[PDB]
Write a protein that binds this ligand. Structure first.
Ligand SMILES: CCCCCCCCCCCCCCCCC(=O)OCCOP(=O)(O)OCCN
Ligand SMILES: CCCCCCCCCCCCCCCCC(=O)OCCOP(=O)(O)OCCN
Ligand SMILES: CCCCCCCCCCCCCCCCC(=O)OCCOP(=O)(O)OCCN
Ligand SMILES: CCCCCCCCCCCCCCCCC(=O)OCCOP(=O)(O)OCCN
Ligand SMILES: CCCCCCCCCCCCCCCCC(=O)OCCOP(=O)(O)OCCN
Ligand SMILES: [Cl-]
Ligand SMILES: [Cl-]
Ligand code: NA
Ligand code: NA
Lengths: 138, 138, 138, 139
């Protein structure tokens, strides 16, 4: 049903990484990733880029050196998504202010145009064939 | 009357979360929430995503393990309300830029068109008279 | 020349604060505000919203309790200004992608339609007068 | 092939500053800029504006007093270039909301009307000829 198609995506990326993070990280870092609810919080703060590296990820990379992939992949993937709601909402907003009625007004203006142009077409037909007759007598 | 309609909702979402803040946290966290004014500055801090979690929320979450609702929800509400204040401005910005005129220049263009098409409904109607006379005059 | 109107303004606000700030704070907080360049770098850092409070503002507010006006006002005002520079660039950006090019077709493609109607006006007019030199040459 | 054009401009700016940065800073700040890999992470971190100053910049400018240029300039160039990516997406978004479609809805529609007019045009000519001959046959 539109934007909330992406929202649902965001919740899902969250859930995937929150689980991924609790599996990978819970033992060695329990306060940040000890439970799945814990990591939902951490990823929230990470997603808002708050001390994500200096206070959460650079620490985690010391234990697990390859774990920048978790953190950089999430910033990348979650930002791109958050971006879209912002877009998907900008757009659908423009649409209500404008596009919705713009297409409508001009669909309709062209009905008028077309109908006028239609009338002319007949008159020229009636006239066309008056002249048709008149010439046949001549 | 447009945007300061929301930009006020902002001002009261602030005022509420700032009283709720002081009542709840004033006592363990005096510096941050000790007084209503002290909590505004703190949420102004929080709203800008400045150190909100490592600096404030997680320490508050240490004392009141539920507090994250207060913090996560403030961010959702204030970020959004700010989003709208923004769209509202991006949109009314497009209007004056472009939709103002494209809408109007068009009404104009298609008056002109309509007039011309009327013009010749006329001749054609008149020519249908002349030919209508040739027929009776025979 | 458009947005670069505010771009100039932003720069003015920036510099007025870097001076308003070196005058107020440089005595007591030299590393942050000691020289003008010093304050500028720190106000750039405050503009990027980075450690603006837990880092710089809070410690300055505890010498100079009133000093929140400075950091809150600077963020508010400079965010508003960057907000607009941003919109102005979207507007301007999409004036190019589409709107300029669209109005170029809407116009030229109605030159076409107008011209077409003008030709049919003449034809009906030329016709309208043979049909009435019949009315006279009989 | 579009903004991907611009995304490539960004990846080039990283590369340049990550190398300018590892050459410049790896002796004194090995953790941050020790190796290219290190240096990029650090720059991605600066780009998200995460402690770029209190955490990374100000410490280095302690040691190399002029390095405010490396950091300030990277945040501009780096950030200004990510803006154009954000616009570019914002645009190609509308292209496919609307512009794509309304743009061509109208091409179609003036075919609809050009074609009509063309028709009327035919008939009026046709009528003229009929008047032409009516005219001659009777002179
Ligand atoms: C998409 C945005 C959703 C982000 C909201 C995250 C909510 C996380 C949550 O409900 O956690 C339950 C309790 O964990 P808590 O935050 O108390 O753990 C801190 C370590 N002691
Ligand atoms: C939205 C602008 C795009 C820039 C990159 C986004 C990262 C910063 C995210 C701000 C977090 C605010 C909470 C998101 C609301 C989601 C529901
Ligand atoms: C829209 C959001 C703008 C909110 C600005 C907050 C105003 C703060 C205020 O009026 O009260 C006095 C300042 O308290 P202060 O920040 O000095 O407390 C630090 C702890 N000693
Ligand atoms: C709007 C964006 C422009 C802002 C960039 C400002 C850069 C100013 C600058 O380089 O000043 C240098 C003077 O001192 P410094 O930056 O070294 O301060 C630390 C003292 N230990
Ligand atoms: C453009 C945006 C993408 C930039 C992401 C940069 C990631 C760079 C990378 O993964 O390289 C190797 C990681 O080194 P690491 O961050 O582990 O170094 C810590 C030194 N103690
Ligand atoms: Cl538009
Ligand atoms: Cl027409
Ligand atoms: Na931060
Ligand atoms: Na931030």
């Amino acid at each position: 049903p539109g934007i909330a198609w992406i929202a649902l995506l965001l919740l899902v990326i969250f859930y995937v990484f929150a689980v991924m993070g609790t599996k990978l990280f819970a033992q060695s870092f329990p306060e940040w990733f000890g439970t799945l609810g814990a990591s939902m919080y951490t990823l929230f703060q990470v997603m808002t880029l708050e001390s994500w590296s200096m206070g959460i990820a650079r620490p985690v990379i010391e234990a697990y050196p390859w774990a920048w992939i978790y953190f950089v992949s999430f910033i990348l993937v979650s930002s791109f998504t958050v971006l879209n709601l912002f877009i998907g909402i900008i757009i659908e907003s423009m649409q209500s202010a404008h596009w919705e009625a713009e297409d409508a007004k001009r669909i309709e203006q062209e009905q008028r145009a077309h109908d006028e142009r239609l009338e002319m077409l007949q008159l020229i037909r009636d006239l066309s064939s008056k002249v048709d007759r008149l010439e046949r007598r001549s």
